[PDB]
């Protein structure tokens, strides 16, 4: 649900879409997430490893 469970309602949202909002929050356009979603996911999975 992203940040919405903190505000109280716990609104579900697809993970790739909330990550796209995180990108807007850092000042990167959300198309950068969807156009590079495979790379971003690979980078995240590698970093957790």
């Amino acid at each position: 649900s992203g940040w919405t469970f903190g505000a109280g309602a716990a609104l579900q949202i697809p993970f790739a879409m909330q990550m796209a909002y995180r990108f807007n929050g850092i000042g990167v356009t959300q198309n950068v997430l969807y156009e590079n979603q495979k790379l971003i996911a690979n980078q995240f999975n590698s970093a957790i490893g």
């Binding site: 697809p14 790739a16 969807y34 156009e35 979603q37």
Partner: peptide, 21 residues
């Protein structure tokens, strides 16, 4: 490239004006 994209019409407010013109 976008995963999960969908097809829909996107309205363009300039088109009906030029059409009427």
């Amino acid at each position: 490239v976008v995963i999960g994209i969908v097809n829909n019409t996107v309205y363009d407010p300039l088109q009906p004006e030029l059409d009427s013109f």
